[PDB]
């Protein structure tokens, strides 16, 4: 039992800052990576980046100036922090832990909704 | 970037039906490829890894093939519970990618 649970804000306004946080149990942060992917609704999956067991991150290429992904080891927490939401972030977050070229286990997912 | 392409993006299907989903990479990915099914509601599942490996629990009537710029998913078969959204990913450098999706749904 591997457990990632999304918690996130809702609805927020648009160029808002936002922090969404994934919780995880059941394993260590230092020995997998935490990946960030989001889905608009009706839309395909889209990767935002991951946070790598030693702390290194790697993001989307489009997205990269308004993202940052940290987390804390010792709270068991990964955080997804975006910048000056655009209404198209509307969209389902999740967190996936990787192991060996997978995501092997997924989180249900937050639902962000960008709204004036 | 290299970018994955799905088709077909949506196939009706019959249960007891055989089909093959096409993930086409625009760059060589050396069989870092992965495939996930996703319900209505529900986050994606993983079904394959590494493009033949079928992970813990997936039935059999589900196999993965390729290599270089061409992979395939063929379901044998179909059952009820196979009815959704299936996606590839790959894993070669980074930035990752998913291709666009296919949606298979019950004729």
């Known amino acids: 039992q591997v457990q990632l649970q999304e918690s996130g804000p809702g609805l927020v306004a648009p160029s808002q800052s936002l922090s969404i946080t994934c919780t995880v149990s059941?394993?260590?942060?230092?020995?997998?990576?935490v990946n960030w992917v989001r889905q608009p609704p009706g839309k395909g999956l889209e990767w935002l980046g991951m946070?790598?067991?030693?702390?290194?991150?790697d993001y989307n290429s489009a997205l990269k100036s308004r993202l940052s992904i940290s987390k804390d080891n010792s709270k068991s927490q990964v955080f997804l922090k975006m910048n000056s939401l655009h209404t198209d972030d509307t969209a389902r977050y999740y967190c996936?832990?990787?192991?060996?070229?997978?995501?092997?286990?997924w989180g249900q997912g937050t639902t962000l909704t960008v709204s004036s | 970037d290299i970018v994955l392409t799905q088709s077909p993006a949506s196939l009706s299907a019959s249960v007891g039906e055989t089909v093959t989903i096409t993930c086409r990479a625009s760059?060589?990915?050396?069989?870092?490829l992965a495939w996930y099914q996703q319900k209505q509601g529900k986050s994606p599942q993983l079904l394959v890894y590494?493009?033949?490996t079928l992970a813990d629990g997936v039935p059999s009537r589900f196999s993965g093939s390729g290599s270089g710029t061409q992979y395939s998913l063929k379901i044998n078969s179909l059952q009820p519970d196979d009815f959704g959204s299936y996606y590839c990913?790959?894993?070669?450098?980074?930035?990752?990618?998913f291709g666009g999706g296919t949606k298979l749904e019950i004729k």
């Open positions: 996936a832990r990787e192991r060996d070229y997978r995501l092997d286990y």
């Open positions: 059941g394993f260590s942060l230092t020995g997998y990576g």
């Open positions: 946070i790598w067991g030693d702390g290194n991150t």
């Open positions: 760059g060589n990915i050396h069989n870092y």
């Open positions: 590494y493009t033949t």
């Open positions: 990913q790959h894993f070669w450098s980074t930035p990752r990618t």
